[PDB]
Amino acid sequence: MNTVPFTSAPIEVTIGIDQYSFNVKENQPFHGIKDIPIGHVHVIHFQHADNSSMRYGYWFDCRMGNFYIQYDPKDGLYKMMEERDGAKFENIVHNFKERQMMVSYPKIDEDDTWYNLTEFVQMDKIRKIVRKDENQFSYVDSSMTTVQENELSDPAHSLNYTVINFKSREAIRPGHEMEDFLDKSYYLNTVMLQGIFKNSSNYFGELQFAFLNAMFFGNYGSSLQWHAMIELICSSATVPKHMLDKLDEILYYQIKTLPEQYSDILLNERVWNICLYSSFQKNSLHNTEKIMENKYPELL
Amino acid sequence: GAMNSSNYAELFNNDIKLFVDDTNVYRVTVHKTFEGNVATKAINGCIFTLNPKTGHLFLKIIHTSVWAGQKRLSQLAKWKTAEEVSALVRSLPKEEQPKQIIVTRKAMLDPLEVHMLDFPNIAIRPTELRLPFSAAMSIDKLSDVVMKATEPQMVLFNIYDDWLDRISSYTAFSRLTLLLRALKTNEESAKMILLSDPTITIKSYHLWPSFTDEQWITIESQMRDLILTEYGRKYNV
Numbered sequence: 341m342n343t344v345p346f347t348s349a350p351i352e353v354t355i356g357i358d359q360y361s362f363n364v365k366e367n368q369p370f371h372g373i374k375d376i377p378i379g380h381v382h383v384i385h386f387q388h389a390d391n392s393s394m395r396y397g398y399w400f401d402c403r404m405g406n407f408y409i410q411y412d413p414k415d416g417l418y419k420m421m422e423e424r425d426g427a428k429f430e431n432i433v434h435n436f437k438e439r440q441m442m443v444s445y446p447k448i449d450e451d452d453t454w455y456n457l458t459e460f461v462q463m464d465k466i467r468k469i470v471r472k473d474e475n476q477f478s479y480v481d482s483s484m485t486t487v488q489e490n491e492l493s494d495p496a497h498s499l500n501y502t503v504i505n506f507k508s509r510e511a512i513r514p515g516h517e518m519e520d521f522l523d524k525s526y527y528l529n530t531v532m533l534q535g536i537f538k539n540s541s542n543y544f545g546e547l548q549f550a551f552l553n554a555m556f557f558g559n560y561g562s563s564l565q566w567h568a569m570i571e572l573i574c575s576s577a578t579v580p581k582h583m584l585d586k587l588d589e590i591l592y593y594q595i596k597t598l599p600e601q602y603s604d605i606l607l608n609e610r611v612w613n614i615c616l617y618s619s620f621q622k623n624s625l626h627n628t629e630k631i632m633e634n635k636y637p638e639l640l
Numbered sequence: 641g642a643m644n645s646s647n648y649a650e651l652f653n654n655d656i657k658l659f660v661d662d663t664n665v666y667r668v669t670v671h672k673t674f675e676g677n678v679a680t681k682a683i684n685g686c687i688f689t690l691n692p693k694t695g696h697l698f699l700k701i702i703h704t705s706v707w708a709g710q711k712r713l714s715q716l717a718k719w720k721t722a723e724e725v726s727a728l729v730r731s732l733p734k735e736e737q738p739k740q741i742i743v744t745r746k747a748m749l750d751p752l753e754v755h756m757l758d759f760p761n762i763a764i765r766p767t768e769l770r771l772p773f774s775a776a777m778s779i780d781k782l783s784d785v786v787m788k789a790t791e792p793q794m795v796l797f798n799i800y801d802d803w804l805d806r807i808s809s810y811t812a813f814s815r816l817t818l819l820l821r822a823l824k825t826n827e828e829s830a831k832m833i834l835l836s837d838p839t840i841t842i843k844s845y846h847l848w849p850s851f852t853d854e855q856w857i858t859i860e861s862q863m864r865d866l867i868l869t870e871y872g873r874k875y876n877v
């Protein structure tokens with residue numbers, strides 16, 4: 341089990357760890373988060389009491405270093421810092437676990453939620469979408485725009501998701517105009533899976549990473565990307581049967597985890613009703629359709 | 641964005657544009673089979689592509705062979721219209737290519753947009769106007785070349801005959817839309833109006849009769865009477 345220690349909590353904040361969250365009061369004795377399952381990526385995120393504007397947070401993998409959180413009073417946020425002196429990290433963290441100053445990552449043993457939300461998410465691929473090579477962890481917030489959104493203005497602070505555009509030469513073979521626009525299998529399978537993502541596990545990891553940036557930070561452009569990657573599969577007549585089965589599981593847990601009160605903003609009517617009812621895959625996402633119908637029959 | 645009465649005059653400025661109507665591309669008769677079922681038989685169609693400023697009409701005849709063995713013909717028709725508009729643009733010299741193409745039905749927008757990706761600098765626009773170009777097949781010479789064609793074929797017309805010698809594009813477009821609207825609402829009366837007087841003739845290289853300015857006013861008035869009336873006969877007023 342790994343540990344995210346905190347230098348102190350000088351400002352009142354809501355702290356998120358993966359799908360959990362808890363309130364910390366200003367200058368309450370608090371020195372971090374213990375018992376974090378090794379082996380998964382994690383996200384630790386922050387919403388200040390005084391300004392619900394700007395959620396922000398750090399994607400990280402405990403195998404890639406010792407990482408602590410420290411409040412910066414100049415830039416005014418909780419920052420992720422790495423302590424390379426391993427023996428000193430073991431000691432300060434032991435010092436805090438002895439004084440019982442750490443909240444315990446509250447995982448239920450029956451619970452495979454975070455696993456099933458992050459199945460294909462790799463820290464290596466995250467770092468290619470969020471470019472700040474000097475750090476092993478990656479910062480995201482609510483207001484960060486995407487590469488594609490920057491085409492429609494600080495590139496260092498962008499989310500470099502894979503650009504998907506259905507009315508583009510990439511997506512449409514000369515002389516197959518109707519065919520490829522109505523049945524996107526060639527964009528999905530040749531251009532994207534074989535050409536760019538190399539495999540569907542990388543496809544799925546971006547898809548999942550987009551959804552989670554949408555849910556945790558309200559990052560609008562991440563939501564666009566999530567729906568675009570769903571749409572390209574739903575809009576393809578020819579998809580490997582194993583991709584479909586996995587997509588159905590992937591979406592099922594995403595829909596399950598979505599807060600019911602955020603569905604109005606986060607879910608795109610047009611995309612979902614196409615996947616579930618109109619498109620080639622209308623009959624292939626049984627679990628996703630069952631939860632979408634029993635939980636959000638309104639959107640449909 | 642979309643075209644309407646508030647930006648109506650834009651059509652006669654000096655930016656090359658084309659209207660595209662697809663309403664007569666896929667045409668069928670519906671009939672009963674020996675078994676008492678119903679079946680369609682297709683007939684030849686056309687794409688009506690029109691420069692509103694010059695009156696040039698690029699009539700692309702759609703021969704029924706283009707449907708043999710095809711499924712979902714109504715959807716295919718839109719895509720086949722886009723493929724043929726696009727080919728027409730590519731055949732034109734650059735200085736002749738339109739800067740805007742306006743579709744008369746919004747369902748054409750994605751099909752044409754997709755076929756015209758290679759022309760990022762041509763705007764593909766819809767319109768809110770309810771233009772009566774579907775009635776283009778009530779013009780006898782147009783209907784004739786369409787129904788006689790035995791193979792695909794692009795025929796060129798000036799839908800304004802010689803009008804621009806004497807009137808502005810604005811006014812020639814206005815006359816054309818009134819004639820076509822009359823044709824659409826009551827083709828028989830519309831046609832009686834136009835040919836009643838046998839001294840007025842249609843010149844071999846024209847589509848409409850050779851009316852003097854004075855006769856045109858009479859004609860235009862009579863077409864208005866028709867359109868209001870049939871709008872009465874229709875809404876009882």
Ligand SMILES: C[C@H](N)CCc1ccc(F)c(F)c1
Binds near residue numbers: 345407421432
């Ligand atoms: C910023 C200093 N050089 C390190 C102090 C510090 C404080 C709390 C930690 F958990 C940690 F890992 C390091």
